[PDB]
Design an enzyme around this catalytic site. Structure first.
Site, mmCIF file in Angstrom:
data_model
loop_
_atom_site.group_PDB
_atom_site.id
_atom_site.type_symbol
_atom_site.label_atom_id
_atom_site.label_comp_id
_atom_site.label_asym_id
_atom_site.label_seq_id
_atom_site.Cartn_x
_atom_site.Cartn_y
_atom_site.Cartn_z
ATOM 1 N N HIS A 1 32.012 35.140 54.899
ATOM 2 C CA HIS A 1 31.186 34.167 55.691
ATOM 3 C C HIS A 1 31.706 33.882 56.623
ATOM 4 O O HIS A 1 31.499 33.491 57.684
ATOM 5 C CB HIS A 1 30.128 34.135 55.023
ATOM 6 C CG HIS A 1 30.697 32.584 54.313
ATOM 7 N ND1 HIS A 1 31.257 32.799 52.923
ATOM 8 C CD2 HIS A 1 31.014 31.823 54.858
ATOM 9 C CE1 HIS A 1 31.460 31.820 52.419
ATOM 10 N NE2 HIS A 1 31.311 30.458 53.595
ATOM 11 N N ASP B 1 32.456 39.335 49.078
ATOM 12 C CA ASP B 1 32.553 37.938 50.224
ATOM 13 C C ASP B 1 33.899 37.204 50.390
ATOM 14 O O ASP B 1 34.392 36.901 49.522
ATOM 15 C CB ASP B 1 31.860 36.227 49.436
ATOM 16 C CG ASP B 1 31.822 35.756 50.953
ATOM 17 O OD1 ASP B 1 31.969 35.438 51.427
ATOM 18 O OD2 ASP B 1 31.189 33.923 51.168
ATOM 19 N N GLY C 1 33.386 23.240 54.142
ATOM 20 C CA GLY C 1 34.837 23.066 54.193
ATOM 21 C C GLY C 1 35.683 24.002 53.625
ATOM 22 O O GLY C 1 36.981 24.045 53.622
ATOM 23 N N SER D 1 34.876 26.537 51.853
ATOM 24 C CA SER D 1 34.638 28.140 51.922
ATOM 25 C C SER D 1 35.985 28.929 51.250
ATOM 26 O O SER D 1 36.640 28.335 52.797
ATOM 27 C CB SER D 1 33.310 28.773 52.916
ATOM 28 O OG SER D 1 32.291 28.157 52.548
ATOM 29 N N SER E 1 33.385 30.986 48.254
ATOM 30 C CA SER E 1 31.477 31.726 48.198
ATOM 31 C C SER E 1 31.131 30.625 48.784
ATOM 32 O O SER E 1 30.775 30.227 49.894
ATOM 33 C CB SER E 1 31.268 32.780 47.493
ATOM 34 O OG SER E 1 29.963 33.088 48.663
#
Lengths: 185, 51
Positions: free
Chosen positions: A33, A63, A139, A141, A156
């Site tokens: 993402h 992801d 932040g 991720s 994720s």
């Protein structure tokens, strides 16, 4: 730069997952993402230190995404902050794990379930995820989930926050390693 | 920003901040909209970017 450090794209900030390589070509993994729609990545908010360009992105469904390094001089450490990572492993229920991210730093917990489905809405559903009781906030991720010197997953998303407690899901890293033919080092 | 399809049970964790009427920087639109729902519609968007 190492796992858990910040990375910036043109639209926002994520975290570096793990430094990986294939032959002599170096890349970094992060969340899909974050890679979706990003082309170039930099090491700082000012966008003066280039890291590289997106080479693959898989989100939703999975992801994970990968960035090929085009910066020749930055050190590409095979660690998470200073922890060395030496292999990748599959998560199991009850496993003690640790996540590092660019907003919250390092937080530990355990894996509570496998193969979970997380619906982010609007058709963005990801499957096959690792559920944990570790917190994460915006932040974080794409940062690494590791257990000792073993790489396990990429952050994720989830719910909650580090002050009150939360639930974060992670993409298993072995799936990404195999999709791109790369390895941790 | 429109928070109609919220709440959402989970949010991705990228950082693209928004400034709420409560003076708090919300890390992304999903986190902002879940807090608008949680406040039963009283929190609003002050401006984009950090507070």
């Amino acid at each position: 730069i190492s796992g858990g450090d910040a990375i910036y794209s043109s639209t926002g900030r994520c975290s570096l997952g793990f430094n990986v390589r294939s032959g002599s070509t170096y890349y970094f993994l992060t969340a899909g993402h974050c890679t979706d729609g990003a082309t170039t990545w930099w090491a700082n908010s000012a966008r003066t230190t280039v890291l590289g360009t997106t080479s693959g992105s898989s989100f939703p469904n999975n992801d994970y995404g990968i960035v090929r390094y085009t910066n020749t001089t930055i050190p590409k450490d095979g660690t998470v902050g200073g922890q060395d990572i030496t292999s990748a492993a599959n998560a199991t229920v009850g496993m003690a794990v640790t996540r590092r991210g660019s907003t919250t730093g390092t937080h530990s917990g355990s894996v509570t379930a496998l193969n979970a489905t997380v619906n982010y809405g609007g058709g963005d559903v990801v499957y096959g995820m690792i559920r944990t009781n570790v917190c994460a906030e915006p932040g974080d991720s794409g940062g690494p989930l590791y257990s000792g010197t073993r790489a396990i997953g990429l952050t994720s998303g989830g719910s909650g926050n580090c002050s009150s407690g939360g639930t974060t899901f992670f993409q298993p890293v072995t799936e990404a390693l195999v999709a791109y033919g790369v390895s941790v080092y | 920003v429109d928070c109609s399809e919220y709440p959402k049970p989970a949010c991705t964790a990228e950082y693209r901040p928004l400034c709420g009427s409560d003076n708090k920087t919300y890390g992304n639109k999903c986190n902002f909209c879940n807090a608008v729902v949680e406040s039963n519609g009283t929190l609003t968007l002050s401006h984009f970017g950090k507070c």
